[PDB]
Each structure stands twice: as C-alpha cells, then as structure tokens.
C-alpha cells in the first residue's frame, strides 16, 4: 500500500533510460490474453511481444536499479540472445518488461513434444545456436548461472534465444563441481551447464540424472561419474560434453571453441537421422 512518487528519481538516470522506455501509446497490452506474462502489441509496424508484469516497486533505489539493469540489458544485442524491446514504469511503480514474442516457447518443451520430429542435425543446430548466444554473453563478461534447455526460447524462424537473464530472469544438476562446493559461478561453470544442455538436446528433454537425489549430486559426481552418452548423440559431440565437464574449470573449452567444434560436427549431417525418445526417460 506504499505510495511512490516517481518524480523523486535522479534526472540523469531518467534521461539515460529514455531509449529503453516505451511510450504508453506505443504498446497495447492484451491483459485479456495471458501467456505473470501477457501478449502485447508494439508499434514501429505492428510487433507481437511478451509483456512481463512485475510486482509493484515502491522504493526509489529499487526503481533506480530496475532502470539501470534495463540500460545494460538493452545493449545485450545478438541473434541468439533474448532482446529487451523496452520497459514501462506505470504510475505508482508498476513495471512492465517488454520482450519479443517467442512463438515456439521454451526449448525444453519444444524438443519434448512428440508431434515434433527433430533430426540429429536439428538438435545439434539448436546446441550451436545456444553456444553462439553464450559466446556473445561471455564476451560481455556476463555469467548466466542458470543455462538450461528450459531457459532458452524459440521464435517463429526456429531461432534459439538464450533467455532467463537480466530483466527476463539452485539448479544443482546443471552446476559445475566447483560451483556446488563454493557457490561461485564463472563462464567456465556456464560451460559445464552448456554440456548438460547438450545432453538435454540429444535426449529430447530428458531430466538429467533421473534416479539421483538433488541433494546428493556432489557425492554422485565425486564417485567419478558423468551423464551417459545419449543413444542418438554422435561420439564427437559426447567427447565435447566430456570436455565441458572437465574437473579443472580452466581446462574446459571456451564458448568460442565450442562454436567452432560444434559447427564442424553440425556440418557433417544432412538431416536424415531422426531422434526418437528413450523408453526409460
Ligand atoms: C516453461 N517456460 C519457460 C519459459 C521462459 C524461459 C526463459 C525466459 N526468459 N524470459 C521469459 S518470459 C517470456 C518471453 C517471451 C515469451 N514469448 C512467448 C511465450 C512466452 C514468453 C515468455 N522466459 N520464459 C516459458 N515457459
Ligand atoms: Cl541428421
């Protein structure tokens, strides 16, 4: 029930965030059409968008951090990274985050869907797109911390966008050994998660370590274990996954190396090997 006067904001920051701000007459939010996220329309040209309605922000410092995140995220521009279209801050501190509409939803549900018929080539292609997204994010010194198939999205062109970061924001079965032990995250721990994401792809969305207790992952891994090679995962791609899970963080490949290696493996396929679901998954 706290009142907030937005005019108490620093005029320099308000000026700095203007290119991120969407005018009230530029966006028609379809509160009737619910995806808390709603369908929206943006003008440029009618543009379909996803409008994430955040909880009301009643602290000027929090409003300030919201506007600052918006500015930084606005410059995270890449074909395989979810873009911020802009932000709205309504009267009384009610925020809207405007993101591009993702027609085919999250990548995990997409590959799981038994009516979709992915090939080995399709699935590796998805992995490659994610690696390109991550190569970009790493170049910006941005550590994702929650990379997973569920956290990537697909548009109408089947372009994969790394999402669930910034204003679009423990996953222990995607976490590197050193992160489980120290609670610190790096680009090299994102590479570990990317390895698990590749496993998710080649299994068409199977949960990693099915019979394994969430609380018991460090002890499991320390017995000398890794995720098994999926039935439809090519040997060189499984070798890549094993490199992503190297016990020495510094010995794991960079995302730039992953893009290179995966592009090569991808190139050898012609879209003739269909990927079917594991009976046990
Ligand atoms: C199961 N699931 C995971 C997600 C998801 C993932 C990452 C992520 N990063 N930002 C968002 S919000 C968003 C953004 C665009 C959308 N486009 C279409 C439908 C839903 C949409 C939701 N997400 N949403 C949605 N369902
Ligand atoms: Cl294929």
Swiss-Prot record:
Location of the region described as Interaction with RANBP9 in the Swiss-Prot/TrEMBL record: 154-281
Q: What does the UniProt entry say about where the protein is found?
A: Membrane
Q: What is the effect of changing residue 175 to T?
A: In RCCP; somatic mutation
Result of changing residue 39 to Y: In RCCP; constitutive autophosphorylation; causes malignant transformation in cell lines
Q: Positions modified as Phosphotyrosine?
A: 274, 281
Q: Which domain of life is it from?
A: Eukaryota
User: Which residues are named in the active-site annotation?
Assistant: 146
Identify the residues that the record assigns to the Protein kinase domain, covering every copy.
Answer: 29-270
Could you say which protein family the record assigns here? Answer: Belongs to the protein kinase superfamily. Tyr protein kinase family.
Instruction: Show the domain comment.
Output: The kinase domain is involved in SPSB1 binding.
The illness linked here is: Activation of MET after rearrangement with the TPR gene produces an oncogenic protein.
Q: What is this protein called?
A: Hepatocyte growth factor receptor
